[PDB]
Each structure stands twice: as C-alpha cells, then as structure tokens.
Structure 1
Amino acid sequence: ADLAECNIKVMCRFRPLNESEVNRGDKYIAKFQGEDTVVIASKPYAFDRVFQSSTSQEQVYNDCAKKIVKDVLEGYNGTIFAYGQTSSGKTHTMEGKLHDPEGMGIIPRIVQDIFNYIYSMDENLEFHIKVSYFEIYLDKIRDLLDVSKTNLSVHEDKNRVPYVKGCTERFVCSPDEVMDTIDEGKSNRHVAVTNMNEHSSRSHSIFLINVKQENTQTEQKLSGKLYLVDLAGSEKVAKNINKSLSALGNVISALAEGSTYVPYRDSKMTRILQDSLGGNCRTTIVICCSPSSYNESETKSTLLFGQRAKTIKNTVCVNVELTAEQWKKKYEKEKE
C-alpha cells in the first residue's frame, strides 16, 4: 500500500591478494558457492550477494548501487557504506580510480547515473541537487569543502532527522560539477594531515547527495538523501581501534536483537546514520574482506557484522512534500 518494511542489504566483496600477501606464505582461504555464499574454515556465510576477487567495479555497481539510485530518484532515502578492516577494499569499492571509466567506483558511477536519468525526463520534472562532503575523525566533523570548519555539530532538520549543521552544500547541475567537488574534497583532506595513509584508515568519509525533485504536472515534491560512506577500519587493537566502530557495532547489535533502546548517540557517526540504520531508508552495506589467511580473524569478524546487519529491517516510504493547498485538496477527497 503506502510504506513497506525491508531488510538492510549486505553484500560481501573479496579482493584478490596483494603483492605483500603473496610474498609471505599467505594462502587464499575463501571458497565460493553459488553467488551468495562464501566458505571460510569449512563454514558458510550467505549474503544478498557475494563478490569474488575477479568481480569488476562495474559488476558491483549494477548489483548494488544501480537499484539505490532508482529509489532515490523515486523520493526514497538511500545509503551505501563500505565496512571492513584497513586494506580490505573499502575505498576501491566506493571510489576506485575516480576518473577511470573501467576503474571508477560506486560514487562516481552513481553520479553519472543520476544525471543520465535526469537528462532523460521531460521538463515537467525539476531536480535540485546539492552535495556535501565531510569526514568524521576522532568523533569530530570536518567539512572537506571548507577545512576551516573542523568541529561541526549534528542537529535535527524540520522533519526531526539528524544532519551536520553548517556544512557546505554545493548546488550542482552536471556530473562534472560533482566530480570537481569530489576532487576538491580529496585535495583539502590533506591539509593539516601528517600521514594520509593512517588518517584515512582511522577516519570516516561521507559524501552526501541531497536530491529534491518537483513535478509541475502532479504538483508533488519528492526528496531523498543519498549517503555514500567510506567507514574507518574495523580492525581491533582487544577492541575496535575506532570507538565510532564500536558504536556502529552496538547499534547494529541493538537493532538486530530488537532492543527498544539503540545507542545511536554513542558517536555522531551513528547519529548521522541513525535513519539509515533503523529508520526511513533503503540501506546497503558492502562488507569488504581480504581472502588472505593472515587476515582470517578480522574477516570472520567482518562476516559476522554483515550477518547481523542483514537481519535488520527498516520501514521506508516515499518522501513527498505538499503545500497546505495541495494537502487540503487530498484531505478533502479522502475525508469524503
């Protein structure tokens, strides 16, 4: 009818072994079945989809993000975030070779698709797309489009949904504008960072696409937020090196158990993704793993996080906006 309940989608992507791993006695320990199951230590883990090391960027996008883009275009909130220990393949998955047609990742592909669609519709559909690009490090938000603001606050919008107050919101009209924006952010992130390899492994990168469209015929306004997240490393020290990752794990556990209380507040990361996790949003998590034997423990660890998240259910619905005028017309036609 109106709204529907849906599970969080969880895709597991293994990457091929790197030079480093090959040089040691590292052996490929992932055994594949069908295309939804992977075996590690004579144990099966079934997901919505399992991607082998040979799976191309393009394949991942089609099986994972293309659908999200379609929902967002329909007025749905969607989220996609990569999860896994450092070097498992999160950035490669979400970003890839930003401008390489064959090597680019989910984000740049989603950007092209959004505009391909728009350029297809008639003039009756008017889209207003603004983007934001910030990062969360040590529980503090920095705007990648304006690095001078380094500790932005999370507030609630008019519809009581979490949002980074005061973060840059660029209005874009073409893919190119979004790409330049993304290049601008990648670049500023280096400022005041004394070691990008370590920094990025320990920080959260969030790219937000706010899509608002209005139909002149139907007189309806739809709006959907699209979070594309490149989480910090899930590896442990005894416990998660990233407290924010401990939070994400607790939130995921609470939801998966059906507990009335969910610790979203433990970190602003989990507060920003509050709607993505248990709310009005179509979320897809891509857990990234190393097929390496040297990494077997972190992998099982990652596979479990995926198995829990998979059991969570959201109650989503299109996000329509009506004026008091439009609202009453319908109210009357219904109050009949």
Structure 2
Amino acid sequence: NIQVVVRCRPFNLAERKASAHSIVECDPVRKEVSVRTGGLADKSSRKTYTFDMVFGASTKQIDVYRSVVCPILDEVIMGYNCTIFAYGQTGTGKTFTMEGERSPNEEYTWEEDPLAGIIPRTLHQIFEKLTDNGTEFSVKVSLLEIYNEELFDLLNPSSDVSERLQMFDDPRNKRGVIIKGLEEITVHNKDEVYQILEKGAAKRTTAATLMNAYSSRSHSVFSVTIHMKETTIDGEELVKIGKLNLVDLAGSENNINQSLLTLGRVITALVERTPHVPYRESKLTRILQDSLGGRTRTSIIATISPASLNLEETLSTLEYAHRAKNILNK
C-alpha cells in the first residue's frame, strides 16, 4: 500500500571532471533500479530492486511533480490526508526534491523556476486549482523541525530558534499530539507564498549556526492544510479539509538520531506484523504515526547517489525503501 519511489541524482561538476562511472542504472518503464556491487563495467555482479516508480538522473523537477505529487495533491483536495517522505544519505537530493532551488542569476521568477521542488509547486498549484473552480478556501502552513528530540517552529517570526516547543498527547482524538505554540501561517494568496518560504529559510540559517550539522541531522515537516467550501455549478456545498505533510528526513547515513532510529524500527514492526509498534519512542513517529500504518496516504521518495563511493549507503537506502513497500495503512 505505501508507495515508495526512487530518485537518482546526476553526477555533479566535481565528478564530471573526474570522469566518474555510474554504478547505478535506472529503468523507469520496468520500475527497476540496478546497482553494480562488485566492480567492472566489462563484467560484474549486481543488485536489483523493483519499486512503485523509478526516476533516473535525467529526471527534472517537473517530471517528479506531475508523476508523484499531482495525484496526491488531488487526493488532499478531496478531503484526505497525505504525507510524502524524502529518505536517503546526505547529499543525494532530499532537499532538492522537497524544496528545490533557485536558478542562478535571477533568470526566473519563483513561479517559473524549473529548479523549484515539491513544496513551492504545490502551494502555487493549490491556488491555481482552487481559484479557477468555484471554491472557497483558506490555506494554512506550518514548519515543524526536530533536532535532537527537540521541536522547533521555523516560521514564527517572533521567537528565535533557541525556543523549543512542547509536545503532549491529544486527549480528544487518539494517537495524535498537540504542539503547544506551533504557529500556523495563513497564506491569503499565491503572491504570499515565496516570502513565507524565505522567512523559514532565514530562520533556518540561525538554526544552523546554533546547532551542529543542523541541515544533516534534523527532520523538517512542512504542513499545508486546506479548508474548502465548494459550491458545484448546482448549489451543493462541500466542506472538505485536506492536509498534506512534506517531510525532509535526516540524513540516513551512519551521535544518535532517535527519530530516525525509531522510524526504522516502526517500519520494521509494521512490515513484520509485530503487534507492538514503537511510535512513542521518538518525536517524529508520534507526530506522524497516522502516516505509518494509519489512515493517511503516504509516499516515500528514496534518493540515491550514482557514484561508486556511496555504494554501501545506496544499498542501505534501497534496501530500507524496499521493505517500506509492504507497509499497509487505511
């Protein structure tokens, strides 16, 4: 049930001038990724995995959005909850897939930058889709980050990153939590998206100087809630509420990361049908527990490197992502 896709990033400039041989080969039509495990392009041993979708190095942001994100966004707009995880070693493209970057020299506007990732495109498409049709709606976003089992709000513009948030169980709905003081920024229109994202980037920079390896060791959860009151061309009123969580996981390479540690164990118990799932043993898994064997539709995008140097880690990732496929929810 949980759909997992693989995305291989392309060799960087440093690897180009050093003329690197890729140990990774993708086959989109056959949903397969093959990895050279022994060495030699003339003769070798290989490991092969089949996932729900595979994207090779030539894949652009647009392909990933039209393929994986558009159908999920549609489900969200119907009143469902969806989650998308980016999993993989640091430097493989987890942030590039989820957030994206800017094209050099101000060549484009944030709405047309071909380097934009899932988060900017989605906020732009929500307004694009709901504004056209006759629908009343409000968009709220939120950016929760976890570092060393502490919670931080990266969008509140009246608090510094030295102020952690408190987490309690929600006495109302089970297996849910309440984050005291978490801010929800209302995005009144498409032309209000970029700055909210800019604010989070700046505050995140203060976070990095205050915590070691912050961007490598932290988990970020960018949430977008959509309150909708649709009115068909007839006069029917549809009040749907959708929530989409975009999670940029800590680097999977191996102090301790309890949330990452617990995520691997939660997945294990779910796939092996173990009665006890260790959701509560980490902030990340308590927060997103409905996205792991719950009533949420979730997708995992595993990012890998094609360089032979990252062999051990590329396999860990694939192998980790291949087991997640057996997780069933709803």
Please state which band the TM-score falls in when normalised by the shorter chain. Answer: 0.7 to 0.9
1:193 maps to which of 192, 198, 208: 208
* Residue aligning to 1:37: 32
Task: Please show how residues 151-190 of structure 1 align to structure 2 within 5 Å.
Answer: 151-156=165-170, 158-160=172-174, 161-190=176-205
Contact 2:150 2:165 in 1 (8 A): yes
Per the alignment, in what secondary structure is the counterpart of residue 193 of structure 1? helix
Is the Cα–Cα contact under 8 Å of residues 89 and 313 in structure 2 kept in the other structure? yes
Match of 1:292? 307
Counterpart of 2:22 in structure 1 is 28
Q: Which residue of 2 aligns with 1:4?
A: none
Residue 261 (structure 2) aligns with? 246
Q: Could you report, residue by residue, the CA deviation over 1:240-299 in whole angstroms, capped at 9, with x for unpaired residues?
A: x52211111001111111111111111111111111111111111100000111001111
Higher mean alpha-carbon deviation, 80-89 vs 149-158, is at: 149-158
1:78 correspondence with 2:87: no
Question: Per-residue deviation at 1:192?
Answer: 4.8
**Change in CA separation of 1:312 and 1:299 when aligned onto 2, cut-off 3 Å:** same
Question: In the alignment, which residue of structure 1 is the partner of 2:144?
Answer: 134
Is the deviation greater in 7-16 or in 212-221?
212-221
> Which of 93, 100, 115 is the matching residue for 2:97?
93
**Contact 1:157 1:163 survives alignment (8 Å):** no
Is 1:17 aligned to residue 19 of structure 2? Answer: no
CA distance in 1, matches of 2:178, 2:68: 25
1:8 aligns with 2:12: no
**TM-score, normalization by structure 1:** 0.85
Instruction: Summarize the Cα distance change of 1:103–1:157 in structure 2 as closer, same or farther, 3 Å threshold.
Output: farther
Q: Which moved more, 1:143-152 or 1:28-37?
A: 143-152
Q: Hey, what's the Cα distance between the residues in 2 that align with 1:306 and 1:186?
A: 29
Whether the 8 Å contact between 1:233 and 1:242 is mirrored in structure 2 is no
5+ residue gaps, structure 1, are: 1-6, 316-336
Give the 5 Å matches for 1:219-298. Answer: 219-236=237-254, 241-298=256-313
Q: Relative to 1, partners in 2 of residues 1:266 and 1:21: Cα closer, same or farther, differing over 3 Å?
A: farther
Counterparts of 1:83 and 1:31, CA distance in 2: 19
Q: 1:150 aligns with which of 159, 164, 175?
A: 164
1:306, CA displacement in angstroms? 0.9
**Residue matched to 1:207:** 222
User: Is the contact made by 2:26 and 2:55 (CA closer than 8 Å) also made in structure 1?
Assistant: no
Contact 1:204 1:230 in 2 (8 A): yes
1:109 is aligned to 121
Contact 1:210 1:226 in 2 (8 A): yes
CA distance in 1, matches of 2:117, 2:30: 21
Q: 1:263 to 1:117 in 2, by over 3 A?
A: same
- 1:132-190 C-alpha deviation (Å, 9 max, x unpaired): 11211111111112243323324427433334332001112212223211111111112
Match of 2:106?
none
**After superposition, what is the alpha-carbon deviation per residue over 1:101-129, rounded to whole angstroms, capped at 9, x for unaligned?**
2110011111111111111221xx32122
8 Å Cα contact 2:140-2:184 kept in structure 1: yes
Q: Which runs of 5+ in 2 are unaligned?
A: 38-45, 103-109
**Separation of aligned partners in 2, 1:30 and 1:301:** 14
Q: Does 1:119 align with 2:131?
A: yes
Q: How much is the aligned-residue C-alpha RMSD, in angstroms? A: 2.0
- TM-score normalized by the length of structure 2: 0.86
